[PDB]
Amino acid sequence: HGLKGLNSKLLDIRSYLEKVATGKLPINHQIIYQLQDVFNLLPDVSLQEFVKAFYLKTNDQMVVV
Amino acid sequence: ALDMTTLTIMRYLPREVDPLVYNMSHEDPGNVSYSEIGGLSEQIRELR
Amino acid sequence: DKKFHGILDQGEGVLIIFDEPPVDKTYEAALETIQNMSKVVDSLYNKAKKLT
Amino acid sequence: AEQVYISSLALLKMLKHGRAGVPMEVMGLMLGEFVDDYTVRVIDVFAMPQSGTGVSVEAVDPVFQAKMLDMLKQTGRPEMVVGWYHSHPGFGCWLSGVDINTQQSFEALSERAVAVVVDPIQSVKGKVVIDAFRLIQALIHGLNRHYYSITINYRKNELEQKMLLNLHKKSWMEGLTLQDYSEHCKHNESVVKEMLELAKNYNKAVEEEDKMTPEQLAIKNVGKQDPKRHLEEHVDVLMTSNIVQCLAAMLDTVVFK
Amino acid sequence: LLKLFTTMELMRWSTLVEDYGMELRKGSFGSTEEGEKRWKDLKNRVVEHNIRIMAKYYTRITMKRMAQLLDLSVDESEAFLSNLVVNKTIFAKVDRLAGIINFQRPKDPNNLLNDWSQKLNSLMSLVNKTTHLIAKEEMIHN
């Protein structure tokens, strides 16, 4: 139910930005800032760090299961 | 206060005092001061 | 004597210290549970041979 | 054969006012229409103010009433006063004689007016208790003697329900939320630990009761807490709680990137 | 002065002493006894200050350059750091062999995961908050 929710919000922002580039997009430099901040918050990174965190965690879950 | 059918609180009250605490409290009216008696300012002062 | 958890490297004349704290409790209780169960199984089968 | 249909908004306003008044038998009026001799429909309700005394004839307030009536006219809710609700909290659904007299005062207004008794407290979450009926446990008061029961149903809409579904739904940002891990670990470490002490309990009950019957059994297990329903029940939390947490991560890692 | 200890930046002792020494001493920091004793504290507070901010920015640090930053040599530093960790005012762990001070705390998979879990949540609000604006414009725009 949450996943369905997500996909919806992303649409919204997507075609809006189009309307930005078409629908006489005024500017809203206040939104674009926030989009950027959404990207900057994007967890990358199958990094040697995370790859271990998740791994060490999943195992704990296995023991309980 | 409690209810007679619903049997729930009908209204909280305070701590009563029965019909005996009045007779010894608000009732018993003392008389004349201590001067009325004496013969031994011993206990009169001692108690005071 | 297990005081501070480290090791001496005499080659370089160094002392290493470590910050141990991994002896996990969960996994311990899990192993203990396996023991109590490994007793319950036997006792369970002790009734089976009788009912079978 | 005769029946009433009680719209949803009516019933919820009903139970709300009743449950709010505990325990002074509130009252209010019912707005609706008489379809035929076999039907009364109640689409609306409004609430009647309280008074130093319980529900009774004068409890009905004419000023208040009409004052509400016209007010609703402006909103197009024009409909007869078809009956009057009421509540007998804790005492089930029946009319006291005092309920009766008033019911008569609503007979001479309309011969088909009905009485509706709601019982807030007992009314369980399952099948809400409601009762509607008119004059001539409850049999003590002459359920069939002075008055007689009726039947009830509920006019519905596919949407109404649809709103109500989300009642016990979740939030939005929900589904992707990952409870504090570290804190979770305690559940598995603390939960598993508590179970450990039980593991031996189950062992002792199998080695013991192993040689008994059910009558002897009631003596054992009505007393203490058999460790059977504890291990099975306890495993429930670990299972699903862990799976949801494990699953949640699996999605956040792949999805959120 | 107060504005100098509010903000977060390196102090460099000498410049401070030069600029403020005169104006301080004039006020009725006194002799070389009870008052003068304050001069040593002030130096301490300065050290605690720089070492207090480095802990903010730098994830790792070295030795020499750290001395340079704190003016003090290898000793005045190691000592200042030791006293701070003893009494506890930072989490720093050294690697002695003429090398590296290490200021990063010791988190565990669980700690790293918290940051990720927390990040995800904050993003949601960016994805949720960010929705109303998009709509507000459509209604106010067309």
From Swiss-Prot, chain A:
Record key words, sorted: Acetylation, Isopeptide bond, Proteasome, Ubl conjugation
One GO cellular component term: proteasome complex
GO MF entry, a single one: protein homodimerization activity
Domain of life: Eukaryota
N6-acetyllysine modifications at: 9, 19
Gene Ontology BP, a term: proteasome-mediated ubiquitin-dependent protein catabolic process
Described purpose of this protein according to its UniProt entry: Component of the 26S proteasome, a multiprotein complex involved in the ATP-dependent degradation of ubiquitinated proteins. This complex plays a key role in the maintenance of protein homeostasis by removing misfolded or damaged proteins, which could impair cellular functions, and by removing proteins whose functions are no longer required. Therefore, the proteasome participates in numerous cellular processes, including cell cycle progression, apoptosis, or DNA damage repair.
Assembly notes: Component of the 19S proteasome regulatory particle complex. The 26S proteasome consists of a 20S core particle (CP) and two 19S regulatory subunits (RP). The regulatory particle is made of a lid composed of 9 subunits including PSMD7, a base containing 6 ATPases and few additional components. Within the complex, PSMD7 interacts with subunit PSMD4 through their respective MPN domain. Interacts with TRIM5.
Family: Belongs to the peptidase M67A family.
Other comment: Does not bind a metal ion.
Protein name, as recorded: 26S proteasome non-ATPase regulatory subunit 7
Organism placement in taxonomy: Eukaryota, Metazoa, Chordata, Craniata, Vertebrata
Swiss-Prot record, chain B:
Compartments where located: Cytoplasm; Nucleus
Protein role: Component of the 26S proteasome, a multiprotein complex involved in the ATP-dependent degradation of ubiquitinated proteins. This complex plays a key role in the maintenance of protein homeostasis by removing misfolded or damaged proteins, which could impair cellular functions, and by removing proteins whose functions are no longer required. Therefore, the proteasome participates in numerous cellular processes, including cell cycle progression, apoptosis, or DNA damage repair.
Assembly and binders: Component of the 19S proteasome regulatory particle complex. The 26S proteasome consists of a 20S core particle (CP) and two 19S regulatory subunits (RP). The regulatory particle is made of a lid composed of 9 subunits, a base containing 6 ATPases including PSMC6 and few additional components. Interacts with PAAF1.
Family that this chain belongs to: Belongs to the AAA ATPase family.
Protein name: 26S proteasome regulatory subunit 10B
Organism: Homo sapiens
From Swiss-Prot, chain D:
Sites bearing Phosphothreonine, chain numbering: 213
Protein name from the UniProt record: 26S proteasome non-ATPase regulatory subunit 14
One biological process term in Gene Ontology: regulation of proteasomal protein catabolic process
Gene name linked to the record: PSMD14
TM ranges: none
PANTHER family xrefs: EUKARYOTIC TRANSLATION INITIATION FACTOR 3 -RELATED
EC number: 3.4.19.-
List of residues that carry Phosphoserine: 123, 171
Entry GO terms, CC: cytosol; cytosolic proteasome complex; extracellular region; ficolin-1-rich granule lumen; nucleoplasm; nucleus; proteasome accessory complex; proteasome complex
Residue ranges occupied by any MPN domain in the UniProt entry: 4-136
UniProtKB/Swiss-Prot annotation, chain E:
Keyword Acetylation tagged: yes
N6-acetyllysine: residues carrying this PTM: 56
Portion of the full sequence shown: 305 to 454 of 456
Species this protein is from: Homo sapiens (Human)
Name this polypeptide is given: 26S proteasome non-ATPase regulatory subunit 12
Assembly and interaction partners: Component of the 19S proteasome regulatory particle complex. The 26S proteasome consists of a 20S core particle (CP) and two 19S regulatory subunits (RP). The regulatory particle is made of a lid composed of 9 subunits including PSMD12, a base containing 6 ATPases and few additional components. Interacts with ERCC6.
Domain PCI: 1-108
A Gene Ontology term for the protein's cellular component: cytosol
Single GO biological process annotation from the record: proteasome-mediated ubiquitin-dependent protein catabolic process
Physiological role: Component of the 26S proteasome, a multiprotein complex involved in the ATP-dependent degradation of ubiquitinated proteins. This complex plays a key role in the maintenance of protein homeostasis by removing misfolded or damaged proteins, which could impair cellular functions, and by removing proteins whose functions are no longer required. Therefore, the proteasome participates in numerous cellular processes, including cell cycle progression, apoptosis, or DNA damage repair.
Superkingdom: Eukaryota
Gene: PSMD12
Lineage: Eukaryota, Metazoa, Chordata, Craniata, Vertebrata
Similarity annotation: Belongs to the proteasome subunit p55 family.
The keyword Transit peptide is assigned to this record: no
